[PDB]
Amino acid sequence: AECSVDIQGNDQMQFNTNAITVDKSCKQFTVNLSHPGNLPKCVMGHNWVLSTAADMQGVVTDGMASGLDKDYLKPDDSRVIAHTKLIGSGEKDSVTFDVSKLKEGEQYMFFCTFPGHSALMKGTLTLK
Amino acid sequence: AECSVDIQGNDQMQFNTNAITVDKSCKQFTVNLSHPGNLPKCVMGHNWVLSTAADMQGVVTDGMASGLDKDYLKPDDSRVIAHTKLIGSGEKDSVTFDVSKLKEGEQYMFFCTFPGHSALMKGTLTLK
Ligand SMILES: *C1=CC(=O)N(COCN2C(=O)C=C(*)C2=O)C1=O
Ligand SMILES: [Cu+2]
Ligand SMILES: [Cu+2]
Ligand code: NI
Ligand code: NI
């Protein structure tokens, strides 16, 4: 099975998918993030961040408070399983993580931590 | 009947109401907008803008392109019936407009034009 997914974050503050399925036969999984919009990072920046459903709110809250210079993520946040950098218009970034970090049955969420975006930019990730 | 309404825009990118009813006996109507959040205008700014439902998308699109220095509103936009200034954390602004500018039966929408906010920060305004 394939072990990567291409995701886009646009100016309408949205991801082009709300669900990701990671096949258990994958050893590593790659997420390619691109920003096909025209707005800069400081105004419409997006990142793809993965945590358990329970940790999401905490990550989003501390991230918001951390500021743009920290890509809106609290430094040394052990709750973040994987994440891309915060990108703006015309940029792209990829993150590859070990699937062994995921456990079956557990609920995972991916989201953007730029202030307010997680309201719409979020989705589930499942290991099947 | 009362002819004013207090509205708040917060850091969670949301208005504390999604519907406004203007009593036809009102000659003027006032909207008091406040921002009880902690984020600055450049990152989480909010304004209250009124237009017909049909004009909303156009106002939001041209506003986004106009930039922060223009309060995210195209200059001389005749589609905007009324609007407050774009405000940030701890700020407040009020707008009073003549109810005669509204017609019964017509569909009106109020929204924030800061990039991406209209996705969640919008509501209906009706003259009853
Ligand atoms: C994109 C990055 C950046 O710093 N910037 C300018 O931001 C100016 N302001 C402001 O006026 C209030 C907060 C803030 O960052 C960009 O446009
Ligand atoms: Cu985002
Ligand atoms: Cu807003
Ligand atoms: Ni395979
Ligand atoms: Ni009255």
**Which structural domains are found in chain B, ordered by start?**
1-128 (2.60.40.420)
Chain B residues in contact with chain A using a Cβ-Cβ cutoff of 8 Å:
11-14, 39, 42-44, 64, 68, 115-117, 119-120
Distance (Å, whole) CA B64 – CA B90: 23
| Burial tier of B62 (Cβ tally within 10 Å: 0-12, 13-18, 19+) | middle
Asked if A56 contacts A111 with a C-beta cutoff of 8 angstroms, the reply is yes
- Experimentally determined by: X-ray
Distance (Å, whole) CA A53 – CA B84: 38
Read out DSSP for B3-22? -EEEEEB-TTS-BS-SEEEE
Distance (Å, whole) CA B69 – CA B86: 10
Q: DSSP 3-state assignment of A4?
A: strand
Mutate to test the interface with B, among A41, A43, A69 (most CBs of B within 10 A): A43
Nearest residue to B125 (alpha-carbon basis) of B46, B59, B49, B16 = B49
* Nearest ligand 1 atom, CA B43: 13
Q: Resolution of this entry in Å? A: 2.0
- DSSP 8-class letter at A73: S
Tell me how far apart the terminal alpha carbons of chain A are, to the nearest angstrom.
Answer: 12
State the residue for tokens 């209250």. Answer: B48
CB within 8 Å: B115 and A44: yes
Residues of B in contact with A43 (CB under 8 A): 42-43, 68, 115
Which residue of B lies nearest to A11 if distances are taken between CA atoms?
B116
B112 is annotated as contributing to ligand binding: yes
CA atoms within 13 A on the CB side of A19: 4
Q: Give the 3-state secondary structure of A16-54.
A: CCCEEEECCCCCEEEEEEECCCCCCHHHHCECCEEEEHH
CB within 8 Å: B11 and A116: yes
Chain centroid offset of residue A91 CA:
15
A83 is annotated as contributing to ligand binding: no
Q: DSSP 3-state assignment of B76?
A: coil
Distance (Å) from the alpha carbon of B79 to chain A's nearest alpha carbon: 21
Q: DSSP 3-state assignment of B123?
A: strand
